Amino acid sequence: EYQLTLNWPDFLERHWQKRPVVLKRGFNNFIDPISPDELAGLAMESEVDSRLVSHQDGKWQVSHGPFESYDHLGETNWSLLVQAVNHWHEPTAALMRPFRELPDWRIDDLMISFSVPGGGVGPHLDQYDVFIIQGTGRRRWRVGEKLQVDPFEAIIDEELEPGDILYIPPGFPHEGYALENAMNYSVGFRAPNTRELISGFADYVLQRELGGNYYSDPDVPPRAHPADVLPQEMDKLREMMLELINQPEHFKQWFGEFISQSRHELDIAPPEPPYQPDEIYDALKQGEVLVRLGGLRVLRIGDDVYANGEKIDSPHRPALDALASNIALTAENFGDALEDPSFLAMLAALVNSGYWFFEG
Amino acid sequence: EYQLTLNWPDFLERHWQKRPVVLKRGFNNFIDPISPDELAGLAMESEVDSRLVSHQDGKWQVSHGPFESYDHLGETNWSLLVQAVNHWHEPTAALMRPFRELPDWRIDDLMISFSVPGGGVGPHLDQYDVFIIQGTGRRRWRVGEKLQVDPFEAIIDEELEPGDILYIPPGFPHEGYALENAMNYSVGFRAPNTRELISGFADYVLQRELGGNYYSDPDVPPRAHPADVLPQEMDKLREMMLELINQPEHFKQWFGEFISQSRHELDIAPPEPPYQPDEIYDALKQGEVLVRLGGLRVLRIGDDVYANGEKIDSPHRPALDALASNIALTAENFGDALEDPSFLAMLAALVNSGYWFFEG
Ligand SMILES: [Co+2]
Ligand SMILES: [Co+2]
């Protein structure tokens, strides 16, 4: 297990969503969870989102995966960047657990880059928070003040060593490149914008035929011009909208289903044949471990728990919270909730969806 | 011009969106704007939304237009119902002008039914207000209390004579059928529901890349379980949404474009060759009349005027208001605004869209 040496209160108070920083020796005696070869082979796979970025003579070249070969790259000036490696590699997923001092719903996935000397993606600006973890090799990283971007004056210019972490808030322009063959591990975050929220909620309202109440004007106001639309009427309409949004169970159900979805593809492999509830029970009681699929988002809002868009209900709150906060579970986590066939059938549904599995 | 004998304050106070009523002699010496033959021929056309409804032996039959023939109907138990006849027939459009005591944005279109004895659409419930105008022939109309619906006890059971009007609020079950060959003219209304508003506004926000502001949590709150989503966070998200909705120029621009669109197809026929602004000027100054396309919705919200989804701006408020409230215009309606080439070009755009034309 990876263990952060960070002062969390300090970080949250001084840096989180405020200011970038290099966390020297963030991880001690850092051992890379994955090797560049394993990463390359991973990028060879079709389900995987990867890209190769290279620069030569002031011009750039981006190529998307999956790659059949890696023959012609050169020894300098290129980088393989692979999205959501935590979806395809467990030891990599281990890198994210130290950062659970920040909320799960905000945490995104883990992107891994390998870069040869000079390799990088050039000067750019992101929109989400990120922790860039230095593995093997060395990288020069530069971050400027809050404004692909034009060259900037750097307020940070450091050479990262294994175990160093570079935190960057959204909006801060940054550029990093390899000095030696290097592995970087971006623990990325995610935050919805208002547009995404409004369109998502609108979809939710459409699909479920909510908000079927019609504008009603028994006290229809007079006007000079019959073509006019009066401010009171505009206000009434707006308040219809605001009222639907403020409805207490609709909004957070929608948000539960929406936020629990991943930005990147999961390794969904439904077991065949499917599991009966009895099977789940037996396996758990026999001491077997139930493992959450890597990257599968399980978030808790109110009484309900949401997994990959699915809403989960159960009178058994402690066990459901166990589902929410344990990536590996055992029978004692569920407790007496295992004696409820409804709960077992719920778990069996989750397993048959491939969201959770036993052992591997 | 048709002239209503209704006491409008009385109606608005006692009936509008409250209670149905028969307005005896609503129109005096009522002359039908269209004949059943003209209506049939109209339904023969492809651009027209019409349907033939018939009942026989306790079973019904609905057939959609356009119809190539009308050979086999019978002499009883059927009705032709044609949508938005005001889009295709000017004297019919004249029937709607008396009802401009109610706001334009709420007024819908005009549906005309012809029915032989026994002809009707059976017992049903609508969702919008309506004024049903009795033309030639007789119809028995029944309306029950606020609950295709099951048979009801009627609080109104009247036989309409030419010039009679039956007002029915949304939700009141009604059934009407011909006693003699009859023409009915439904001045229908329209009101958006919350769902339509939220999805429309969401579309508007998507298309125009609004609401690009991301959720920001520098003061990210602590939790017992990292999988939890806290109420403060839900509130923050909700308030992002409410804030975007409350933005003063975005909402009413969207609503302007949205509400000014018709529920039924218009007769859009762009003139060829297009009009130059000089042409518009000349025609107006020569005394020619500029006529709004039948059914074309022109509504005014704030300084802006909206036509069929298009937003129209002009420093010349009186003339724009003229565009808003006059279905037939002359040069004196526009005044000095005609000496502005920008305004002329605006009018020329409107004409070239086929939204307005000269004379016919
Ligand atoms: Co970046
Ligand atoms: Co009706």
Curated annotation (Swiss-Prot), chains A, B:
Q: Which residues form the JmjC domain?
A: 91-206
This chain belongs to the protein called: Ribosomal protein uL16 3-hydroxylase
Task: Quote the Pfam families the UniProt record gives.
Answer: JmjC_2 (PF08007), ROXA-like_wH (PF20514)
How it assembles, according to the record, is:
Homodimer.
Species of provenance:
Escherichia coli (strain K12)
Q: What's the catalysed reaction?
A: L-arginyl-[ribosomal protein uL16] + 2-oxoglutarate + O2 = (3R)-3-hydroxy-L-arginyl-[ribosomal protein uL16] + succinate + CO2
Q: Name one GO biological process term.
A: post-translational protein modification
Report the co-factor binding details: Binds 1 Fe(2+) ion per subunit.
- Which GO MF terms are attached to this record? 2-oxoglutarate-dependent dioxygenase activity; ferrous iron binding; protein homodimerization activity
